[PDB]
Enzyme design. Sequence first.
Site, PDB file in Angstrom:
ATOM      1  N   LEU A 153      36.933  31.519  52.669  1.00 15.38           N
ATOM      2  CA  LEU A 153      36.402  32.540  51.712  1.00 15.38           C
ATOM      3  C   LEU A 153      37.455  32.665  50.583  1.00 15.38           C
ATOM      4  CD1 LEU A 153      33.783  34.194  51.312  1.00 15.38           C
ATOM      5  CD2 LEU A 153      34.943  36.199  52.378  1.00 15.38           C
ATOM      6  N   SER A 154      36.953  32.938  49.383  1.00 13.09           N
ATOM      7  CA  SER A 154      37.727  33.098  48.179  1.00 13.09           C
ATOM      8  C   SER A 154      37.266  34.393  47.550  1.00 13.09           C
ATOM      9  CB  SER A 154      37.445  31.813  47.280  1.00 13.09           C
ATOM     10  OG  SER A 154      37.761  32.041  45.953  1.00 13.09           O
ATOM     11  N   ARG A 155      38.271  35.347  47.387  1.00  6.12           N
ATOM     12  CA  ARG A 155      38.130  36.695  46.989  1.00  6.12           C
ATOM     13  C   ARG A 155      37.325  36.821  45.763  1.00  6.12           C
ATOM     14  NH1 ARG A 155      41.461  41.292  47.257  1.00  6.12           N
ATOM     15  NH2 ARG A 155      41.482  41.059  49.567  1.00  6.12           N
ATOM     16  N   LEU A 156      37.543  35.937  44.739  1.00  3.45           N
ATOM     17  CA  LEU A 156      36.813  35.978  43.453  1.00  3.45           C
ATOM     18  C   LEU A 156      35.642  35.162  43.574  1.00  3.45           C
ATOM     19  CD1 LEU A 156      39.479  35.452  40.652  1.00  3.45           C
ATOM     20  CD2 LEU A 156      38.961  37.496  42.040  1.00  3.45           C
ATOM     21  N   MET A 157      34.481  35.820  43.601  1.00  8.61           N
ATOM     22  CA  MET A 157      33.301  35.040  43.976  1.00  8.61           C
ATOM     23  C   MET A 157      32.225  35.526  43.061  1.00  8.61           C
ATOM     24  SD  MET A 157      31.622  33.038  45.993  1.00  8.61           S
ATOM     25  CE  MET A 157      32.866  32.606  47.231  1.00  8.61           C
TER      26      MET A 157
END
Lengths: 205, 593, 45, 457, 457, 129, 51
Positions: free
Chosen positions: F120-124
């Site tokens: 997962l990547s916080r800026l989505m």
Amino acid sequence: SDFTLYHTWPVRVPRPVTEKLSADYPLLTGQRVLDALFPCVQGGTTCIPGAFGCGKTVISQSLSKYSNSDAIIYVGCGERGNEMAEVLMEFPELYTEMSGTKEPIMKRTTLVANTSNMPVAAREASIYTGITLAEYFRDQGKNVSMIADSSSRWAEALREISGRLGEMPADQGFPAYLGAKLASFYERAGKAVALGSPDRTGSVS
Amino acid sequence: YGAIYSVSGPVVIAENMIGCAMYELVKVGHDNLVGEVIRIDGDKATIQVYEETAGLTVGDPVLRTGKPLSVELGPGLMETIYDGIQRPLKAIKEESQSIYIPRGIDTPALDRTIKWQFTPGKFQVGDHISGGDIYGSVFENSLISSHKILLPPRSRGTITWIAPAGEYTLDEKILEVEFDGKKSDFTLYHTWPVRVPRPVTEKLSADYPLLTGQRVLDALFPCVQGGTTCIPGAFGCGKTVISQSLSKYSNSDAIIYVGCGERGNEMAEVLMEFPELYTEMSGTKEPIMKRTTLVANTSNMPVAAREASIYTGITLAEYFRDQGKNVSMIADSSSRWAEALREISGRLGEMPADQGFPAYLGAKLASFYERAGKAVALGSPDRTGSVSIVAAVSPAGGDFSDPVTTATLGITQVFWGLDKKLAQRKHFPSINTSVSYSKYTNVLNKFYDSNYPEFPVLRDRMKEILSNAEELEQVVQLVGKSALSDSDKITLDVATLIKEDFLQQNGYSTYDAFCPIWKTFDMMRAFISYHDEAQKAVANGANWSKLADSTGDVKHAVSSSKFFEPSRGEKEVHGEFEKLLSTMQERFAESTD
Amino acid sequence: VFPTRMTLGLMKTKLKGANQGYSLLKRKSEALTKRFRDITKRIDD
Amino acid sequence: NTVSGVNGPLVILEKVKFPRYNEIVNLTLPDGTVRQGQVLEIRGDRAIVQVFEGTSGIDVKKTTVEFTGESLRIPVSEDMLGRIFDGSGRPIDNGPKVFAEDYLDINGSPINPYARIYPEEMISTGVSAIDTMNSIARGQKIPIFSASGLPHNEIAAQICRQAGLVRPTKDVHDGHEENFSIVFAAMGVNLETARFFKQDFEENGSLERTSLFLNLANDPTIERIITPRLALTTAEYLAYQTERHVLTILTDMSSYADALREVSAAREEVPGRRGYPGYMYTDLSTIYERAGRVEGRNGSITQIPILTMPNDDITHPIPDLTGYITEGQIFVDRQLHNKGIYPPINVLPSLSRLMKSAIGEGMTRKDHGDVSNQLYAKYAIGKDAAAMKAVVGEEALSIEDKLSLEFLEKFEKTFITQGAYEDRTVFESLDQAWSLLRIYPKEMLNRISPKILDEFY
Amino acid sequence: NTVSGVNGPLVILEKVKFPRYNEIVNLTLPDGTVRQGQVLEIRGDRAIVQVFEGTSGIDVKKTTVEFTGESLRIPVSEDMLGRIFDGSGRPIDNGPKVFAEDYLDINGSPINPYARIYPEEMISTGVSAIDTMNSIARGQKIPIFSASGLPHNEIAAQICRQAGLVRPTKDVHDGHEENFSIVFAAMGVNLETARFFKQDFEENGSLERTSLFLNLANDPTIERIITPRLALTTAEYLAYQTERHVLTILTDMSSYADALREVSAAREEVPGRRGYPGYMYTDLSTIYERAGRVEGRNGSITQIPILTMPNDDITHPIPDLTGYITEGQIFVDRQLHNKGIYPPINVLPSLSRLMKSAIGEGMTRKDHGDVSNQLYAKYAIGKDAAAMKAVVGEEALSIEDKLSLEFLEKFEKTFITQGAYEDRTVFESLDQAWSLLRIYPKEMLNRISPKILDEFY
Amino acid sequence: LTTAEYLAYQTERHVLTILTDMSSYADALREVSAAREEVPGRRGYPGYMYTDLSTIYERAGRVEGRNGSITQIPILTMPNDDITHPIPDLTGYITEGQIFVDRQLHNKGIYPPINVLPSLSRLMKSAIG
Amino acid sequence: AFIILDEVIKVTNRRVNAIEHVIIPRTENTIAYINSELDELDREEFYRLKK
């Protein structure tokens, strides 16, 4: 200065080359499963599990026998000393698989054999002495098989020295300097073209 | 002499202190507190002061008395409750109006105004004497003379004077010996440094079993006298309750009970309970108390006070052994002695080496256990004494392989388990059959064998039943009960009988919590006679369920064995148990057919 | 979460428990499966 | 002379050899403000102090020092109750003026009271899970082990609230006809929590009867730990001198512990085992010093310290050293909390080993010891069975185990579920214990002597 | 110079720097008490010594020091067999001196008088279980790893005493034609336990064959490390010079680990995990250096160390490091001990890295290596099969496993159960082996050649 | 980093930095901590392990003129193969997400073996328009 | 009998697989994390004291 038939080279300093190559050349072991299933490399780095005399020393003795490399350098880092005795005696009775003569396997093997009882300097210097020697043979244009037994023992030589001196060792009571030292050692070995105008090819595995 | 360099903690450091040893008695400050110089680092001596510092000034003088710190072993030891270096607590209650004196007071080691009865021995004028010889006695138990007054080790010569029988004071002479010139005059007491052992002529293996009385202790392996023993804890295992039970049941000449660094409430418990308890042989005035000499130290007393505790107590036991008496030393908790070694380590600010514990920790433990043992008494008359040490342990390092428990299990010879979970659930004293061994078992069992008991044969089969039970216990959990054969069910079922009757111990002494060794053999004889019959029935055909119905009456009896008393059948075993062996046979014949 | 000091003795025995359990119940299974095969053939006939 | 250094909050003063041990020094700062300090150590031509007041205002050589000449002692009086104090002695009601009749050492080296009379009569709480299982006797130090991630402070407030209805419960039992006082010591306690506590005492009507010593953690560490010590000494005055019964509630023991670690870091002392000191034990024993029945053998000081397990384990330094000095423990569970059973006490690892001695006749039954034993054993089996249900399945289970599963639920929801203001007598609590026990017939109960069983079944 | 100080076990002497290392000093006390020590450290006008007896009771201006001028060595002779020494090499005979013919330094030898030659001849312990399954060979070290659930010293005694009764059985076989000797070292033994070992040698006639060096539990940690070095040098003399095979028994290595851990490898220095030094390896390795085949080629020192596992642990440093240097181990267990099995030896977790290859042929038959394959296999299958019996019964149990269930029982009760003073030769041991396998037919012993099997069945 | 922010700054370039291996760098810090008068904190690694890692991560983001940037993909090999070990735990906190590679995939012969179970990547919803 | 066998094999199979997947690797993960913490305490303790 004056020069002799031998040359000295410091044990922690590795001998130099014109450039290193990516190995693509195999070992001359001729061990069939070894060759076909997960192909042997000469100019490679290889980790083998053990637990001592449940097969691991046995395979090192097998590797020596089937092999017929230009040189083989045998390193006992810090072994049981029954095992070192065994390596010495079996080898001149054995036969080289290229069909050479004159104490066959022993003739191609040069042995640095330290049991763990013998001084700690000799244990730590053992891998070092082997890699510098091996690297020189790489400069000579000889393909070398380097057999080390065992690096677990070797990490221990370092931890001992660390506690005596009164420096702090790091993770799991084993030193700070450990990781850089293990790492340098595997990366030193590999396929290269020797230093100088002739450019002979060697390998250290 | 010296000037106080630092007061740091309850630890005092004092400069200008040289010519002092590491055993030297020193008085600290101008309030003259009791102290001992433990170590010296240069001109500065490191002194542990066994009273607290709550206004100890720097630069006050420190006076070396010119002799070691010792304790007096002499008259007045029994029927008295003492502190870690021994000064009458009873006198302190009244005078000082406090349970132990204020800081900056010193009270004498014994009562000085109390006069005692001297008897002259077997060493008169011109007879030669040596240490551990009986020059006389005092009386400190009614039925016996529990205290032989002995010559200290390395005291010799020929006697110029033996005082005749009568009353003397303890500070007044009753013996003079001439050796290298006048060696000294001697008094009723003698001083001996307590950190230091009291010599033995020779040690002779423990081989005399003598009761523990507890049902479980007697059962797995025999009871032992002259042995050494570890019993686990966690300070929530009914450790105080078995100790009180242990005092009454042991029939030894002398007992030393040592509260190492205990609650204070625990010290109340024993001091109050002991005179109410009747001595099993034949009573004395305030029966159990009069045969016990108590070192009662709380934990709330400084760290210095708790370390002298274990030491003075063993030194009273070693004198008694040399006197010709079999001693039971009960120590609770040896882990609190070890806790104390940690505290002095933190205060001294030394580096650990033993998992958060000081360098000296392993060695100090090992030394304690050796002083204890079965011996031929020190002296030229030669008498028998033994010291059996029962030592409590508990963790103290947050680990299950902790430095206190590991080093003690090595030096011990009897190991009897105990689980915290069982003990809370009601099975105290608890015992773990796979985490136990006893080295003395082989000789001791053979001793019980010759007197009447068939004892060796039974002991091995009791453990065996319990071994198979552990294996069964895992299958029982997982698969269930619906898969085990008839033989396996029995193993569990006879195991129940042992768990019920031996591991549980109902009351202080009510419900006949006291079992003699011979009763215990009879309790066991009834279960294993039942096991062999029970094993034959299933094998010769008889369902587990069928066999349980048909056994009926003989099974209830063996279940009921613990309420019964042996004092109304013979005097040590029950006529009821003899009758039980006939009934078993009869039952079996009907039931099989 | 998980204990700070010495879960290891417990966890050692938990590890042992688990492992014995798997072996025994696979043996119990092995016997049931072996018998069942034989019974399946008897039944078809 | 002047400050040699300051390292953390601890101060090194280079001064002469006239101060004693625990003698107060008065630091004169050129800000026109005095702060007070206590010598942790006196050493040659220097003193190591940690300042009670402030934390800055220090100078290198513009500082001046003077010695107070008086070692720390408490002014203790006949009336200390019905008043709010701080350990630092600041005026929030009272604090610097509190009357005086004696000055007593915090060290407690002169009087040092200690039992030599057995833990006598029962002390009521009206909680069945305290009184039945563990049982409390006068002079006892039994601890409440609680956890973090759950409010430890809430379990202290329920004990506070039901406390003082307790004295009537004892009155009924007879042989108690003397005053009751609560001595409440707060150290590391939050401002919001402090107000709660004040509230509990008030609602019962025990405010008049309680003395409060308050410290917060924004006061220096050395002060924080002295605050309960001063309070135990005050309790001792009431107990010994006017022959009253004192229950002192000392919260939070973790907070006492926190201070110990911080203090020492370049002195002779240095923090040992697991980052918590090696002399941590002594510090707990100083609190234990002033516990037990007092001399003359009327009155008692009884003590229930409040301890929090921070990760919910006994192997951690704070619960581990303590439980050894204590004589049993009381275990607070997270799982009963989440379900909504209040007060949530699991009795599995809870025992107090002087239960036998504590209980007697005429105020407690003879069955009382027997009754606790039965509840543990069934409750334990029930728990063990619930775990096997989970992995393997109900092929492992048996009929006996069904009784046990059923027994766990009846115990949790009836015995352990009660008010925060719902007090009980000891006789009722044993009567309810029995109710649960009725589901096993006589032949499967064997944690009681059969003689006793026939009477009460 | 006089004693500066003593801080714990370590003693500081201000004495000048002219003494050499390993140099014995004499502590001259005013109490008529002379004590000897070896310099741990020699420094510039100070020396740190740990004293062989005691550590306290010395002064700083009434105790004075003198240097002997002679370093730590043992007077070595062959008249030392039948003689009782302590842990400095002084007698506890109460009669005549040690006797010398050479003085040998004790440090793992000054010159190292050993060669490395692979083992080739059987060494026998007089118990079938050790010898068939995990054989002992000349210059090979296989320790007995036991636990504090066992009577580990008592088992240790059985190995040692039965030794050298083997030598006349070997003599008829022609494997040893040169003498047997025993060197026994007690480290950290009890007075009573020590006595048991000695009495067992008298009874067997093995007293004449052993020299005992004694370290008692109450003697200093430095005394204890000196103790095995005395035993191995004495063995090295017998072995090298008069060609004897010498079997050296070192019990207890666990105490030896304790002495090092405590001080003399943790003096103030930092040790590795769990307080046990990381150079504890280096120390173990000194002992192993003075062990092995020596010049003569009828001389060797064969070693059986005894290590007692604290709680049966496999993650503790002690069995693991020691275990790397030694060529296998014999694992003892608690499980057998309960059942009433004596000596309780299991051969399944156990390993001998070189079985046939280590030992010879001429005094042991050729079948030893083959038989060991069958006994090991069956034994493994056998543990599993018993657990299966418990569940399945015998109505659906497998046939192969049914014979293995009975096999587990006999392997314990006759091949592992033996007498106290029952001695069995290697030939004999081999025969018993075949008897247990005789129940199975050939088709369940298929891992062996029909020629060997047809002869041996 | 100095090389990469100079291109990015001066001539307004996106530079992508592949920094292999993060633990090798940790390793060296570990040796000049043993050699310093520093005490090592979490698991034999430096108690200033934060300051090291953070120096790298401050430089990343848009640089002046907002058409130059430095974008980072650092490469970490797990020295003990655990996500409780300090190196990945600090590193993961300072960075924006993580991409997980799982051994079971690699062996099977999947390529790329990107197991998306914790990836997962916080800026989505802040990296898209 | 065959039908009861039919039922029991399904249950018994569930269990062998359940111990295998969920329990054993949970037990590996826990034992390692607390072993490494535990060791860290013993070594750091020595390091702080030595320094």
